[PDB]
Amino acid sequence: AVSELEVDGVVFPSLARPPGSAHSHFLAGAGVRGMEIGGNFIKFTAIGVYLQADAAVSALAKKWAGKAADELASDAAFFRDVVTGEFEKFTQVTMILPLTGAQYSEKVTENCVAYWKAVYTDAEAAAVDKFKEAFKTETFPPGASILFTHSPAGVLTVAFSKNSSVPESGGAAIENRPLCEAVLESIIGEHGVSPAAKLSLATRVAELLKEAAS
Amino acid sequence: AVSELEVDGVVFPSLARPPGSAHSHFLAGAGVRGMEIGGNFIKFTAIGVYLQADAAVSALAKKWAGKAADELASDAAFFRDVVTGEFEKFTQVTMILPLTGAQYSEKVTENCVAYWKAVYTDAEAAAVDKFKEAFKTETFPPGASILFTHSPAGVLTVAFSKNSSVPESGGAAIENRPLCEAVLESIIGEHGVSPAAKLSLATRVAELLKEAAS
């Protein structure tokens, strides 16, 4: 089934074919990402979350079938299950405000870094280095998108999309399951950077799970 | 290394990550689809042809290395080798003059099955109707793009892009070598709709094989 959603101006297609992926993805959820400055919620980006067209839902249904929107929303194990699921995920980050690749890299990376510090090998450091070198000569105006593909393997594909042409390569694919998962968890995790996305996601997947029961 | 190509407004990235593909592709060449009408020369389409980054150069290099761009542009066998090669290709079709899903579908359908008419196994008829239906309810204003991915064995992945978002799916992949190859040969083949794209292609690929050949 599944519908297309519009966050701010950004329009997210219902069914998609991501770069670096052989399968179609359905729009699982979408929502604004912003900051709290001076007691005001400034919107920075619009995030869309896509899941593998049939792998996901079948996979989720085993622990989450029957459960409702609020129930799924109130459970961290759910969002960790979609983050870690044995299927392809995809994330679209479209800009409302302008960001630079350096700053973006800087604190999607530094928090993964910090956490891994607390418990972080050389594979992690290398993956991070490839990530930010992928990002530091780039610019993102309003409308510019970042396309993240999270393959079931831990391979992270990075594409960029100003305008309507083919997504442009962000470099070589980065094969590091911790970073690949972490990029997505920064969004949907427990201290997920976009609560709106999580709510939408939970609601829609709930609907899809009930619909299976013919 | 390659360069970005601008074609009446449409920007083609030098290094792309197409949907349906694990690999990066390099912009092999790009040019308009044009046609003489009355007073002037009307631009219909802007087409970009991409080849699998690592593999294309290697596969083409032993029949066509050393050979000059002159020689390539002149010989149809070369373009047959690009169409037929054991590497994956990608092509982007960008409007900049409004067309329908229908209009384009049947743009390509007959000519293939005209060829197939004379020299037509069901698999082609079925594939043709899956293609046709994959397009039927879509509409392409100026700026919109069709994104075709051709795997080595001839499975065709279709996507659409009217913005900076992740490409929207055109449905299930179409597995048929004749049609998959036909879609690209319609562009760079003997009766190839865009001569300019071939010229560009020969020019760039020649320098690439020289570069890579020692």
Numbering used by the authors:
A (entry chain B), B (entry chain A): 1 to 119, 122 to 216
Please, what does the article write about this entry?
In plants, flavonoid biosynthesis begins with phenylpropanoid metabolism in which phenylalanine is transformed into p-coumaroyl-coenzyme (Co)A. Chalcone synthase (EC 2.3.1.74), the first enzyme responsible for generating the basic flavonoid skeleton, then catalyzes the condensation of three molecules of malonyl-CoA with one molecule of p-coumaroyl-CoA to form chalcone. Type I CHIs—which are found in most plants including barley, rape, petunia, Arabidopsis, and rice—isomerize naringenin chalcone (2',4',6',4-tetrahydroxychalcone) into 5-hydroxy-flavonoid; whereas type II CHIs, common in leguminous plants, utilize both naringenin chalcone and isoliquiritigenin (2',4',4-trihydroxychalcone) to synthesize 5-deoxy-flavonoid. The family of genes encoding CHI in Deschampsia antartica—one of the only two vascular plant to naturally colonize the Maritime Antarctic—was recently characterized at the molecular level.
Unliganded DaCHI1 was crystallized in the C2221 space group with two molecules in the asymmetric unit. Our analytical ultracentrifugation results showed that DaCHI1 is a monomer in solution with a standardized sedimentation coefficient of 2.14. The seven α-helices were located at the concave surface of β-sheets and the active site was formed between the antiparallel β-sheet and α-helices. The substrate-binding cleft of DaCHI1 was conserved, with hydrophobic residues from β3 (Met36 and Ile38), β4 (Ile43, Phe45, and Ile48), β5 (Val94 and Met96), Leu100 of loop 97–101, α4 (Tyr105 and Val109), α6 (Ile190), and Val196 of loop 192–197. The final model showed Rcryst and Rfree values of 0.222 and 0.278, respectively.
